[PDB]
Amino acid sequence: RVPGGKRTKELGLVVPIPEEDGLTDGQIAALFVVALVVLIAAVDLARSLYFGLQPNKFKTAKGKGSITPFMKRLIENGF
Amino acid sequence: NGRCATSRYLQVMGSIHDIESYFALDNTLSLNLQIFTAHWGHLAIILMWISGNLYHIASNANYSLWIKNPIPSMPIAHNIWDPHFTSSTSTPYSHTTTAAVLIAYSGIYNQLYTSGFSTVNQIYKATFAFSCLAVISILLAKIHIRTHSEVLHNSATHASQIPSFFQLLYFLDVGISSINIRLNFHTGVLVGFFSIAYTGHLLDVAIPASRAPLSHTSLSYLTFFGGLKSDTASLYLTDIAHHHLAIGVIFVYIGHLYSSCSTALGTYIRDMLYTSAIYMFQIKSLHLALSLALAGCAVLTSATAQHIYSLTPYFYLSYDYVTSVTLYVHHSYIASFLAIASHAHAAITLVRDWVAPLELESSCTIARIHTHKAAIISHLSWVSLWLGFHTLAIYSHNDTNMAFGSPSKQILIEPTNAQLIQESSGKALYSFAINSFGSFIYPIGPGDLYVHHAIALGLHVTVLILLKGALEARGSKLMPDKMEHSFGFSCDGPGRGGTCDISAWDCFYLAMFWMLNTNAWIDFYFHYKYLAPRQFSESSTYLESWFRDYLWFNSAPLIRAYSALGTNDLSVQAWFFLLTHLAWATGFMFLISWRGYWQELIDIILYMHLKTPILIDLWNGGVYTPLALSIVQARFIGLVHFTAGLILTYPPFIISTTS
Amino acid sequence: SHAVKIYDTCIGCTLCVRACPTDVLEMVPATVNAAKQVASSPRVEDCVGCKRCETACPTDFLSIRVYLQENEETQYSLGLDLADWS
Amino acid sequence: GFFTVASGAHASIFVIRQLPTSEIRHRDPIIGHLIWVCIALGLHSFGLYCHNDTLEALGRPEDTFCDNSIQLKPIFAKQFLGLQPGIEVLDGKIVRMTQELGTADFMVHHIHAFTIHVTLLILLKGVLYARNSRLVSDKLELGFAYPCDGPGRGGTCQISPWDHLFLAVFWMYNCLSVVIFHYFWKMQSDVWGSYVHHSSLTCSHYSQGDFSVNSITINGWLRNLLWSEASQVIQSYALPSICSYGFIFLAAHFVWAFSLMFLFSGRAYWQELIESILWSHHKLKIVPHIQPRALSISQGRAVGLTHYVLGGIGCTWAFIISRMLVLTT
Amino acid sequence: PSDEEILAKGCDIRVDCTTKEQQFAWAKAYYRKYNQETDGKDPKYSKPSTGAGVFRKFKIDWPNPDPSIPDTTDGTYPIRNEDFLPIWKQQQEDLRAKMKEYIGREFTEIRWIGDYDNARSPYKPHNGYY
Ligand code: CLA
Ligand code: CLA
Ligand code: CLA
Ligand code: CLA
Ligand code: CLA
Ligand SMILES: CCCCCCCCCCCCCCCCCC(=O)OC[C@H](CO[C@@H]1O[C@H](CO)[C@H](O)[C@H](O)[C@H]1O)OC(=O)CCCCCCCCCCCCCCCCC
Ligand SMILES: CC1=C(C#C/C(C)=C/C=C/C(C)=C/C=C/C=C(C)/C=C/C=C(C)/C=C/[C@@]23O[C@]2(C)C[C@@H](O)CC3(C)C)C(C)(C)C[C@H](O)C1
Ligand SMILES: CC1=C(/C=C/C(C)=C/C=C/C(C)=C/C=C/C=C(C)/C=C/C=C(C)/C=C/C2=C(C)CCCC2(C)C)C(C)(C)CCC1
Ligand SMILES: CC1=C(C/C=C(\C)CCC[C@H](C)CCC[C@H](C)CCCC(C)C)C(=O)c2ccccc2C1=O
Ligand SMILES: CC1=C(C/C=C(\C)CCC[C@H](C)CCC[C@H](C)CCCC(C)C)C(=O)c2ccccc2C1=O
Ligand code: SF4
Ligand code: SF4
Ligand code: SF4
């Protein structure tokens, strides 16, 4: 390095550099696989946020909707 | 809507996240669900940021080598892969045959080292786990969207027999808008139990990692020493663990206060507020909740900014000359932003959330404040005027006398009150020791007194502007009917004498300049006293010392970074010093020159484009017809340029001077 | 487009109508005041938002109010000349 | 500069009060081409400086625009005096010396042209669009000095010839500051100084001839001209000669910063603050019957402009005069 | 000892290099080994071009060069119109002698605040008219 700091030059502070890179190609690939999973989930989340709630679902969607018993208890308790 | 101008993009981007303003966001249920999903996405972003920092430390950096010799070594942030750099010869950031690297000024190395990270494998495992946590956060967002959709479907499919079925309209967002249960679980589990868990982590991982000899975890790991261990120059890890244990126990106890899951136990926040001094307010108001959270976060961010520097909690953090200053300045700026944010959202609450009673009725705290807002503002103005007049006048007296060469003629008021408080604190600490604290007590002189009064002036004026905006947001003598208009509107016309900057958003715009000033004053004070304690003590009583011994003197390395002689590792800092100066100057344009001139100029440019031979036959100008930025849009853009330049031109200076 | 509203405090002096640059306003018969007329805003689609009516209003606080709506900007309210949205 | 912006102002006033000449009837092409030439000039001239900065920072001087690197020779800058070779000296000083033009002179001269053209653009737009425009068609009825026509039509701020001057003054001040800095640095580096012994003299210049090497970069201007040559004024407090100049430097900085108050803020905030303050006076029975009012919009602009220009000019004045006084004595 | 063996042994606070002096000795050895005082930029970019008397080297104004700029590239500037200075001195000395003879007496320094009678005044001199 060509240090430009007065304190660095005075005290001889150094930026030690390893001989070998910390992570290997396989480790970087695994991290990238996890990042890809994150990206897919994030795209799905962005789509959901963009489209918001769909109150029409009760007209065509399968099932009859459900409220968890704890959610019902919270509703009964109130705010 | 095909009929649109180029102002469409700016109008949209100014309210992209203003979910309350969204079209077809019918109800509070939609609002709350959207906000919850946005919160989940935000947590995912934070976790990805943590994972990226950890990954780059593990891969591009030298954590293993640094932990061997932390004092002289400098951590690496990440590699530089920039094609624009010179290829003929090695760059200042390389070892003449090595990848270019950047030093890290975030203290994350000290954080990991005192947390108990010994090998890059542990950092890699953390990178992986935080990425998994981001996945979990996004999936939880999706899960909750689905659950709330399933409740709407249910409510649609099932109906109570009596006509009161419409009452269920209010309880669909109970899970997101309930306050008692949220308070209980946040303060008990998210705070107290989190502290207890971190105590467990310390005892299991951090203490054995720091201690060379093995010793079984026991109460010996909990201690009440104080001050900094000499070897690491940081707070004893054993004390941090007890600290967090004590706070966790206290907050776990406090987390049983409200009735959360059953009505048999706990008290109600409505009931406390009703029976307390503050009559009651719209606790349901999301803007009010945001304001309170932002105020608390601002005070906590200021507290951490001061205390991380005062009492070093991280191994060898004090030895890092640059990282200390960077951390202090970073968290001071974040705290100032959060404070002004709380004020702005209180103003928005008043604009569009508070349900004011009839004029003569005075039952709520907000109405009582609005009764004498005039007195509040007048007294705040008086305090600001006094502070400014006398601070500036004493500084100018000292300036003139020093310029004439007579330091003995300077007015030097000894800080007797602060010195007495400091002496009492020192007496208590000395008694405790008889039964070291570095940077918790500082010499304190007349220069400190003057700088403290200047910072008080800054705070008082910022609060003056913000309070005036908040209390005139609903109405004003100049604009009585300000409730009908939006939070931020251009003006009210040149009539009534002229109505520039008449909105509560315009008061925020104005208070932003002050925040930046008062934060600049605070940062300059800290940096000057840090760089040159003796020179600051002797010479900080007149402003020429600040202008010469601090700025002009310490500006040399940065500007000399790259020149005709060559370049060094601060060349990037020197280029960002100038880029940010240019950004500030550009912001001046949007702040000074207003919209009519630019609209006419845009009209002329559009005429030229429509008269050009080839371009006219393709581009009509009908779609996204170019227009000059609106008044509020330009105010905001100029403010953004000003803020970016002001904030970003400092870190280069502090790094250059402290490195 | 902007929203131009008139309130009964109106005294029917016609100054707003005379100050209108694009003829958005017109006086209409009324019994609320002594002048027996009140300004109306039928052609609010042409209102540009200059607030010259507001400048010319005498009443203690304005009997005519122009609320700007930047989201609903039209070519008439923007005074577009070189480009046409019609 | 001041009298040129004045000429623009009174041209606008004449257009408002009297019938303009027929060149106003094709004003759109005129101002459009002036806008284009201003944009192109600014882009090229200032982006050469920015290119030099970026490349030099990256470590590639061979890629920058300078005499040693890619050079922009001023071919048209030709002599006409036909002087004899050498310089003229008088008692240890260089009374006269030829100025040698290179890439730095090319770049700075095109910066000068850019700034002059932008100031002219503002003045000419104010003059030609004084009577009416596409935005507002009754600007003649509005007059000469009005703040706006309203928030309408997007916003008609500073559409008046008065405001066009209010901006042209900023631009004239910018142009003249750059001209002053160019003259000062070039004279110090390449003309003025002393000499040390047909006889040949080695000329020791006050700035050491650093204009041709450092002026090619904005960082060079910031370091070798402002920071480096502000040593005299910044360190003038103890010295009997120039302590006043140092104090005026500081005070001019203060005044320039204080102008930003009026340049950024608006009338309504101050009117509301004044009313809130006046509440207390009325409470205590201090009733001023000349009711306090916030400064009008045009007055606020004028005050801001005056303080801005005065502060900048004072800083430059003190800096240059301190440097010259110390160097010559 | 020496930088080679210092770096071969290495530094580790955790195990042996518990001495700040040893730590900074190793740091200084590493600095000397791996750090350079300057980037090594070509000295030519630092040399002046205009006003240093070396303008002709760059050939900036080759087509129709300006005569006033010296052709020599050594960096020295000749004095323009050297030949006239002896002539000017001779002319001024000759004029001094001529006026001295014309007056007939030695030149007397004028007084900034003094008052002198006109040579043609009709009244008796108070202060010598010269
Ligand atoms: C022509 C000038 C130039 C250019 C084009 C670049 C380009 C680059 N430099 Mg830089 N650099 C320059 C000059 C330049 N440099 C100079 C003069 C120096 C000093 C000697 C440096 C010193 C330097 C260093 C030390 C480093 C770089 C790095 C980089 C790379 C950044 C990559 C990155 O993460 O981008 C991402 C960019 C951003 C996050 C900033 C975005 C900001 C804008 C305003 C957008 C904000 C987002 C907004 C929402 C809009 C999104 C729109 C989009 C979706 C379409 C890139 C190749 C870094 C590198 O190597 O990275 C691998 C790096 O470490 N440069
Ligand atoms: C823009 C916002 C911002 C930014 C950019 C930063 C930046 C920084 N802060 Mg932070 N900070 C902020 C706002 C911000 N802060 C605010 C508002 C506050 C007040 C609350 C703080 C309070 C604060 C403190 C008190 C400290 C920092 C520190 C730091 C550094 C980060 C260290 C790090 O990431 O270690 C990497 C992280 C780890 C190794 C572990 C993180 C552990 C957490 C708990 C992870 C999240 C838990 C997860 C969700 C749990 C899963 C669920 C399960 C339990 C069920 C850096 C300078 C530290 C510092 O200065 O270090 C020198 C520091 O001590 N900040
Ligand atoms: C801040 C002061 C405060 C005040 C004025 C009240 C007032 C009230 N609380 Mg209480 N409460 C408080 C704090 C407070 N609380 C705290 C901190 C908690 C969390 C532990 C609770 C949890 C709580 C519950 C769950 C309930 C109440 C209820 C009540 C009512 C009856 C009180 C009673 O009978 O006390 C007399 C009783 C005692 C003094 C015995 C208390 C013993 C336990 C262990 C708590 C003590 C904890 C201690 C202060 C902290 C230890 C710290 C650690 C370091 C050792 C009354 C309205 C009841 C009610 O009617 O609600 C509608 C109810 O159901 N409170
Ligand atoms: C679509 C855009 C968007 C995005 C990206 C976010 C992002 C965020 N919102 Mg949300 N929000 C949005 C829109 C959005 N919001 C809208 C439209 C509204 C309606 C007005 C809200 C209303 C809202 C509220 C009411 C709150 C948030 C909060 C948050 C945070 C979510 C959780 C988190 O990660 O906190 C990470 C935060 C931390 C790790 C810091 C924790 C410490 C807290 C903030 C301070 C606690 C202080 C305490 C009360 C008092 C201490 C006392 C002591 C000093 C003695 C995050 C910053 C919460 C927040 O933290 O606000 C500051 C919050 O309270 N938002
Ligand atoms: C440094 C501050 C600054 C800057 C950059 C500008 C820039 C400009 N002003 Mg000025 N202006 C300023 C301050 C500034 N102003 C202030 C404080 C005021 C208030 C008094 C004004 C008032 C004002 C008026 C009233 C007018 C101007 C005009 C102009 C334009 C001149 C012509 C042009 O664009 O050529 C030069 C452009 C530049 C130098 C901009 C930077 C270009 C760089 C070097 C190259 C870009 C490289 C690359 C493509 C970037 C990509 C980035 C991306 C990938 C992220 C230009 C946009 C005039 C105009 O618009 O005429 C057409 C005009 O009428 N200004
Ligand atoms: C980098 C460190 C240093 C710099 C730090 C950042 C700069 C400081 C912050 C700026 C200070 C103000 C902050 C407050 C923000 C809210 C204000 C607001 O909404 O009002 C901004 C207002 C909102 O708009 C107004 O709203 C009113 C209703 O209240 C009315 O409808 C008005 O007519 C309407 O104009 O004005 C605008 O519309 C502004 C135009 C915005 C144009 C931006 C488009 C370009 C974006 C590019 C950048 C990417 C953005 C994402 C960033 C990524 C970050 C991860
Ligand atoms: C279809 C069908 C049938 C069938 C069938 C049969 C027999 C199908 C067999 C399928 C078979 C045998 C499929 C193997 C997949 C292996 C995978 C995906 C491995 C990935 C491994 C990965 C992604 C690992 C990656 C890494 O971690 C590694 C290893 C190193 C780390 O550094 C990091 C990385 C990321 C680099 C029936 C049942 C007969 C009838 C039915 O009717 C129809
Ligand atoms: C390695 C490998 C592989 C793969 C690869 C790849 C293909 C990768 C990719 C990668 C990538 C490509 C990545 C990326 C990532 C990204 C991310 C991670 C991001 C995220 C985001 C977030 C988190 C956020 C978001 C948001 C926004 C910003 C706005 C709003 C909305 C939201 C919130 C959503 C394979 C399997 C073939 C084989 C084996 C190996
Ligand atoms: C310069 C300036 C302008 C003119 C500037 C304008 C119109 C913006 C210039 C456009 C910039 C260069 C960004 C355009 C870049 C690309 C065209 C982006 C297109 C991508 C879209 C899809 C978003 C104003 O309109 C104005 C209004 C009020 C006060 C001050 C000012 C002001 O200072
Ligand atoms: C501050 C400010 C005000 C408020 C400023 C006012 C009312 C000026 C006060 C005038 C005083 C009373 C004149 C007397 C002169 C000074 C008090 C002299 C001080 C001299 C010192 C050396 C002591 C506006 O009204 C305004 C309007 C439009 C745009 C910007 C602004 C603006 O910036
Ligand atoms: S258009 Fe501009 S100058 Fe005119 S009143 Fe509105 S904000 Fe003020
Ligand atoms: S709106 Fe105003 S000006 Fe028009 S008639 Fe009513 S009171 Fe008169
Ligand atoms: S704002 Fe202007 S155009 Fe609109 S009604 Fe009022 S006077 Fe007419």
DSSP assignments along E14-83, one per residue: TTT---HHHHHHHHHHHHHHH--SS----GGGGS--SSSS-GGGGTTT-SS--TTS-S--SS-EEBTTTT
Please give the backbone phi and psi of residue A49, each rounded to the nearest 5 degrees, phi first.
-65, -40
Q: How far apart are CA E44 and CA E52, in angstroms?
A: 14
Q: How far apart are CA D61 and CA D55, in angstroms?
A: 7
Cα radius of gyration (chain D): 25
Do residues D318 and D254 touch, judged by C-beta distance below 8 A?
no
Do residues D20 and B50 touch, judged by C-beta distance below 8 A?
no
Do residues B458 and B521 touch, judged by C-beta distance below 8 A?
yes
CA of B293 to the centre of ligand 4 (A): 7
Angle at B129 between CA B124 and CA B132, to 5 degrees: 130
Q: Which residue carries 């440097």 as its tokens?
A: D323
Check pocket membership of C66 for ligand 12, CB cut-off 6 A. Answer: no
Interface membership of D88 toward E (CB under 8 Å): yes
Interface membership of D25 toward E (CB under 8 Å): no
The Cα-based distances of D35 to B227, B345, B600, D120 in angstroms read 66, 42, 12, 10
Q: How far apart are CA B218 and CA B204, in angstroms?
A: 10
Instruction: Enumerate residues lining ligand 10, CB below 6 A.
Output: D 261-262, 265-267, 270, 294-295, 297, 300
Residue D87: which of E39, E46, E77 has the nearest Cβ?
A: E77
Interface of B with D in 552-591 (CB under 8 A): 552, 555-556, 559-564, 567, 571-572, 574-575, 578, 591
What is the number of the ligand 1 atom nearest to the C-alpha of B79? 64
Which chain A residues are closer than 8 Å to E28 by Cβ? Answer: 12
Residue of A nearest to B259 (CA): A77
Taking each helix axis from N to C end, the angle separating B446-472 and B321-352, rounded to the nearest 10 degrees, works out to 30
State the DSSP H helix or E strand holding residue C27, giving kind and residue range, or none if neither. strand C26-29
CA C76 to chain centre: 14
Q: Which residue carries 């026509």 as its tokens?
A: D149
Q: Which of B561, D45, D66, B559 is nearest to E48 (CA)?
A: D66
Please give the backbone phi and psi of residue B135, each rounded to the nearest 5 degrees, phi first.
-55, -45
What is the number of the ligand 12 atom nearest to the C-alpha of C38? 5
Q: A29: which residues sit within 8 A by CB, 6+ positions away? A: none
Please give the backbone phi and psi of residue B228, each rounded to the nearest 5 degrees, phi first.
-105, 130
Which ligand has the minimum distance to the alpha carbon of residue A32?
8
Q: How far apart are CA D313 and CA B32, in angstroms?
A: 56
Write the residues followed by a gap in chain A (C–N more than 2.5 A): none
The Cα-based distances of B71 to A15, B327, B452, B487, E21 in angstroms read 11, 18, 33, 52, 11
State the DSSP H helix or E strand holding residue B259, giving kind and residue range, or none if neither. none
Distance from the Cα of D271 to chain B's closest Cα (Å) equals 7
Which ligand has the minimum distance to the alpha carbon of residue B276?
3
The Cα-based distances of E77 to D93, D202, E53 in angstroms read 13, 6, 6
The token pair that represents C33 in the structure block: 């005041």
Which chain E residues are closer than 8 Å to D195 by Cβ? Answer: 77
Contacting chains of E (3 CB pairs or more, <8 Å) are: A, B, D
The Cα-based distances of B382 to B386, B460, D69 in angstroms read 6, 10, 61
Three-class SS state of B549: helix
Q: Is B103 exposed, middle or buried (0-12, 13-18, 19+ CB in 10 A)?
A: buried
Give the type of residue at B408: S
Do residues C83 and C73 touch, judged by C-beta distance below 8 A?
no
Distance from the Cα of D23 to chain E's closest Cα (Å) equals 41
State the DSSP H helix or E strand holding residue B492, giving kind and residue range, or none if neither. none
D153 and C82 within 8 Å at the Cβ level: the answer is no
The token pair that represents E94 in the structure block: 């000759």
First to last CA, chain C: 15
D136: left (phi over 0), alpha (psi -120 to 50) or beta: beta
- Residue E78 pairs with which residues in a beta bridge? D200
Q: Which of D252, D223, D219, D221 is nearest to D321 (CA)?
A: D252
CA of B83 to the centre of ligand 9 (A): 30
Three-class SS state of D70: strand
User: Which of the listed residues B9, B84, B91 should we mutate to test ligand 1's pocket, taking the one with most ligand atoms within 8 A of CB?
Assistant: B84
The arrangement of strands across the sheet holding D200-204 comes to D194-196, D200-204, E77-78
E69 and D98 within 8 Å at the Cβ level: the answer is yes
Three-class SS state of A52: coil
DSSP D227: I
CA of B520 to the centre of ligand 12 (A): 50
CA of B251 to the centre of ligand 3 (A): 13
Three-class SS state of D160: coil
Q: How far apart are CA D297 and CA D266, in angstroms?
A: 7
User: Which of the listed residues B598, B600, B623, B624 should we mutate to test ligand 9's pocket, taking the one with most ligand atoms within 8 A of CB?
Assistant: B598
Do residues C18 and C57 touch, judged by C-beta distance below 8 A?
no
Taking each helix axis from N to C end, the angle separating B595-611 and D161-190, rounded to the nearest 10 degrees, works out to 90
Q: How far apart are CA B365 and CA B356, in angstroms?
A: 11
Three-class SS state of C42: coil
Q: Residue D322: count other Cβ atoms within 10 Å of its Cβ.
A: 27
Q: Residue A10: count other Cβ atoms within 10 Å of its Cβ.
A: 9
The Cα-based distances of B413 to B393, B398, B421, D299 in angstroms read 13, 12, 16, 40
Three-class SS state of B396: helix
Which chain C residues are closer than 8 Å to B481 by Cβ? Answer: 61, 65
Three-class SS state of B78: strand
Q: B617: which residues sit within 8 A by CB, 6+ positions away? A: none
The token pair that represents D289 in the structure block: 């019957």
Residue of B nearest to D233 (CA): B548
Residue of B nearest to D240 (CA): B404
E30 and A11 within 8 Å at the Cβ level: the answer is no
Q: Which of B226, B611, B252, B229 is nearest to B433 (CA)?
A: B226
Q: Do chains C and A touch (3 or more CB pairs under 8 A)?
A: no
Do residues B50 and B130 touch, judged by C-beta distance below 8 A?
yes
- Residue D201 pairs with which residues in a beta bridge? E77
What is the number of the ligand 1 atom nearest to the C-alpha of B574? 19
The Cα-based distances of E45 to B502, D49, D269, E129 in angstroms read 55, 16, 54, 66
Give per-residue burial for D84-114: e unless 16+ CB within 10 Å, then b: ebbbebeeeebeebbebbbbbbbbbebbbbb
The Cα-based distances of D75 to B518, D66, D190, D303 in angstroms read 52, 15, 20, 45
Q: Do β-strands B101-103 and B76-79 pair in parallel, antiparallel, or remain unpaired? A: antiparallel
Residue B11: which of C71, C80, C83 has the nearest Cβ?
A: C71
Q: What is the DSSP string of B197-246?
A: HHHHHIIIIIHHHH-SS----SGGG-----SEETTTTEE-HHHHHHHHHH
DSSP B318: T
Give the type of residue at B318: S
Q: How far apart are CA B555 and CA B559, in angstroms?
A: 6
User: Which of the listed residues C4, C8, C10 should we mutate to test ligand 12's pocket, taking the one with most ligand atoms within 8 A of CB?
Assistant: C10
> For chain D, where are the E strands, in sequence order?
88-89, 94-96, 194-196, 200-204
Cα radius of gyration (chain A): 27
Do residues C25 and C46 touch, judged by C-beta distance below 8 A?
no
Q: How far apart are CA B52 and CA B45, in angstroms?
A: 10
Q: How far apart are CA B608 and CA B250, in angstroms?
A: 71
Residue among C18, C48, C57 with most chain D CBs within 10 A, to mutate: C48
D68 and E60 within 8 Å at the Cβ level: the answer is no
Give per-residue burial for B208-229: e unless 16+ CB within 10 Å, then b: bbbeeeeeeeeeebbeeeebbb
Q: How far apart are CA B227 and CA B207, in angstroms?
A: 17
Interface membership of A4 toward B (CB under 8 Å): yes
Three-class SS state of C39: strand
The Cα-based distances of D234 to B528, B545, D179, D237, D250 in angstroms read 18, 10, 22, 8, 9
Q: What is the DSSP string of A5-48?
A: -HHHHHHT-B----SS-SS-HHHHHHHHHHHHHHHHHHHHHHHH
Please give the backbone phi and psi of residue A72, each rounded to the nearest 5 degrees, phi first.
-60, -40
Interface membership of D43 toward E (CB under 8 Å): no
Contacting chains of A (3 CB pairs or more, <8 Å) are: B, E
Q: Is D200 exposed, middle or buried (0-12, 13-18, 19+ CB in 10 A)?
A: middle
The token pair that represents B365 in the structure block: 């705290």
The token pair that represents B638 in the structure block: 């100029």
Do residues B573 and D58 touch, judged by C-beta distance below 8 A?
no
Q: How far apart are CA B470 and CA B349, in angstroms?
A: 9
Three-class SS state of D244: helix
Cα radius of gyration (chain C): 14
The token pair that represents C37 in the structure block: 């007329």
Residue C68: which of D149, D151, D156 has the nearest Cβ?
A: D151
What is the number of the ligand 10 atom nearest to the C-alpha of D297? 28
Helices (H), B473-554: 504-531, 533-539, 543-545, 553-554
Q: What is the DSSP string of B143-207?
A: HHHHHHHHHHHHHHH---SSGGGGGGGGTTTHHHH-SHHHHHHIIIIIIIIHHHHHHHHIIIIIH
Give the type of residue at B626: P
Q: Which of B347, B648, B354 is nearest to B511 (CA)?
A: B347
Q: How far apart are CA B192 and CA B200, in angstroms?
A: 13
Residue C54: which of B11, B493, B627 has the nearest Cβ?
A: B493
Which chain B residues are closer than 8 Å to E14 by Cβ? Answer: 67-68, 212
Q: Which of B191, B64, B57 is nearest to B130 (CA)?
A: B57
Do residues B254 and B192 touch, judged by C-beta distance below 8 A?
yes
Angle at D309 between CA D303 and CA D315, to 5 degrees: 130
Q: How far apart are CA A21 and CA A14, in angstroms?
A: 18
Give the type of residue at B198: Y
Please give the backbone phi and psi of residue C73, each rounded to the nearest 5 degrees, phi first.
-65, 135
Angle at E92 between CA E89 and CA E96, to 5 degrees: 135
The Cα-based distances of D161 to D11, D118, D151 in angstroms read 10, 16, 18
Residue of C nearest to D152 (CA): C49
CA of E79 to the centre of ligand 13 (A): 76
Q: How far apart are CA B134 and CA B43, in angstroms?
A: 7
D268 and B513 within 8 Å at the Cβ level: the answer is no
The token pair that represents B395 in the structure block: 């500084």
DSSP C71: T
Cα radius of gyration (chain E): 38
Q: Which of C54, E4, E12, D25 is nearest to B478 (CA)?
A: C54
Q: How far apart are CA D160 and CA D145, in angstroms?
A: 6
The token pair that represents B475 in the structure block: 């109405």
Distance from the Cα of B614 to chain C's closest Cα (Å) equals 17
Q: How far apart are CA B168 and CA B532, in angstroms?
A: 66
Hey, CA dihedral for B411, B552, B523, B103, is it positive or negative?
negative
- Residue B76 pairs with which residues in a beta bridge? B103
Q: How many CA atoms lie within 13 A of B232 on its CB side?
A: 22
Give the type of residue at B139: L
Q: How far apart are CA B303 and CA B331, in angstroms?
A: 9
Q: Do β-strands B76-79 and D94-96 pair in parallel, antiparallel, or remain unpaired? A: unpaired
Q: Which of B206, B248, B240 is nearest to B224 (CA)?
A: B240
Q: How far apart are CA B196 and CA B189, in angstroms?
A: 9
Q: How far apart are CA B120 and CA B56, in angstroms?
A: 11
Q: How far apart are CA D186 and CA D209, in angstroms?
A: 8
Q: How many CA atoms lie within 13 A of D113 on its CB side?
A: 16
The token pair that represents A71 in the structure block: 């959610």
What is the number of the ligand 5 atom nearest to the C-alpha of D49? 44
Interface membership of D153 toward C (CB under 8 Å): yes
Q: How far apart are CA D104 and CA D215, in angstroms?
A: 6
Cα radius of gyration (chain B): 29
Q: Residue C34: count other Cβ atoms within 10 Å of its Cβ.
A: 8
Q: Which of D134, D269, B491 is nearest to C51 (CA)?
A: B491
Residue of D nearest to C2 (CA): D152
Q: Residue B33: count other Cβ atoms within 10 Å of its Cβ.
A: 26
Resolution in A: 2.8
Q: How many CA atoms lie within 13 A of D85 on its CB side?
A: 15
D263 and B591 within 8 Å at the Cβ level: the answer is yes
Check pocket membership of B165 for ligand 9, CB cut-off 6 A. Answer: no
The Cα-based distances of D204 to B27, D230, E58 in angstroms read 79, 20, 21
Q: B461: which residues sit within 8 A by CB, 6+ positions away? A: B384, B388, B514, B518
The Cα-based distances of D6 to A76, D161, D205, D300 in angstroms read 77, 12, 38, 19
State the DSSP H helix or E strand holding residue D252, giving kind and residue range, or none if neither. helix D243-264
Nearest protein CA to atom 19 of ligand 8, as residue: A39
The token pair that represents D324 in the structure block: 């010259």
- Residue C64 pairs with which residues in a beta bridge? C6
B500 and D35 within 8 Å at the Cβ level: the answer is no
